[PDB]
């Protein structure tokens, strides 16, 4: 059916959206923008299209295998307390007279509404449930993106989704998909898995596969198959019912309502802001892509899936032969309703593959041993840092990036330096901050960063040094592009920040010792001193 239909009501912003940047970080302010509701119409047109889906034996057989692993999962209901506790403090308020504070505080109004909504889910498995549609405000750098579309139900329901399904989405995928399930990995563990399966092959080939607006390609069938996979678990008979009702009344589609309460149309594909979105997309992508691998007769495949993001590493059959089987894989994905954005291409070098917006690169530790780490073109992370350093923002990409990308040349020399300089200057190293990891919101203390890095990465991450020239280029190149100081300058700024940090002692001294040991010249020798990378909750309204 049609992915979306539109009345003509506009997608309407709730508050004023600043499209541009209000300068110690980057001179070229004008290359940095935020998407707004102004660009909705374009995104609307890219994401709205009909879906033809043609299954086959290869799909049916994979689905049957998934279902048998799923059948060995036990999962439980969460109490309202447990589900209320998972809500982020600044989650959108309900239209029925209570917000997230009340949810978090177990106010008997919020609880009693939630009981009413849970009750309605069990009595009625048919009425589509309302959703709100919103343009996202996301920052990037020039060379332009239309705002992405978020779609989400009222708070009362979000809390019900938790009761019904939090344990399924936190436990099932890793059982069904084993090592393919990407969100069970920290960065370090992810590099290790990619690198080791690269070396496990006689003659390796790998490829990323970019699905054209994945959410829109997901059909109502896809979502019901998905439901049927959850039902394989040993579930409470009430949980079994709420899940049926949630998928029929919400996951499958429903009316779309703007900030003004006008009706915008009707969704028949994935909602990006429900609890199952991450688990759904991951299971759905793993299913089709596994099917696609069989159609293409790809030998000895390893997959790594993160929502709609896919990498495959396998045995080469030769260059002609690989390219040809890649096209088959693509025809097969396209039959299953998941056609390609960029055409997918074979790569014979692990470092040249991008997945979850990252590629492996190689460097050396203090002994001179070769160490692998994940990195990326740093344009967006710097862009959003420039923004977060400028306007005030409730979420901090920079800290997330520090954590995700601690070993990188760009995160060490630029981010840590910049933000520790700012916290230092505003006497604010102590304040916990909200950042996002695999879509869950964590409150994190910057002073704890050394411990966090040693655990997610290893002591090596404070001492890496002979970075690949390709990496080094992309970095200084990005910096020229954006108008940010060259790396020589950061080294000098870091030397100073290192020093002030040490002069404060305790944990700020530890930050000085460990984080900026790269900057010194003659190095201090460094000695040693979660429930975090377990599953994906993007769009899922989660707080740990
Ligand atoms: C390990 C790893 C790799 C890529 C990622 O991409 C993201 O957008 C968010 C988190 C993340 C984590």
Numbering used by the authors: 1 to 22, 28 to 148, 154 to 539, 548 to 562
Quote the authors verbatim:
In this study, we presented a ligand-observed MS approach for high-throughput screen of a 384-member fragment library as well as reliable estimation of binding affinity of each fragment hit. This approach was integrated into a FBLD program targeting the RNA polymerase of Hepatitis C virus (HCV), NS5B, which is a particularly attractive target for anti-HCV drug development. Similar to other nucleotide polymerases, the domain distribution of apo HCV NS5B polymerase bears an anatomical resemblance to a right hand with subdomains representing the fingers, thumb and palm. Structural and mechanistic studies of NS5B have indicated the existence of multiple allosteric binding domains including palm I, II and III pockets and thumb I and II sites targeted by reported inhibitors. The proposed discovery pipeline combining our MS-based approach and other biophysical techniques resulted in identification and validation of ten new fragments bound to two distinctive domains of NS5B, among which five were successfully translated to X-ray structures of fragment-bound complexes valuable for structure-based design of potent inhibitors.
To characterize the binding modes of the fragments studied, they were soaked in NS5B crystals to obtain the protein complex X-ray structures. Inspection of the crystal structures indicated that fragments 114, 204, 117, and 328 all bound at the palm I allosteric domain, while fragment 162 bound at the thumb region. Fragment 117 binds at the pocket mainly through van der Waals interactions with Met414, Cys366 and Ser368, whereas fragment 328 forms van der Waals interactions with Tyr415 and Cys366. We assume these weak interactions may result in the lower binding strengths observed for the two fragments. In this study, four fragment hits and the designed ligands all bound in the palm I pocket, where an overwhelming majority of NS5B inhibitors were also found to bind Specifically, Met414, Cys366 and Tyr448 in the palm domain of NS5B have been documented to be the “hot spots” for binding of high-potency inhibitors3854 and they were also found to be the dominant sites for fragment binding in our study.
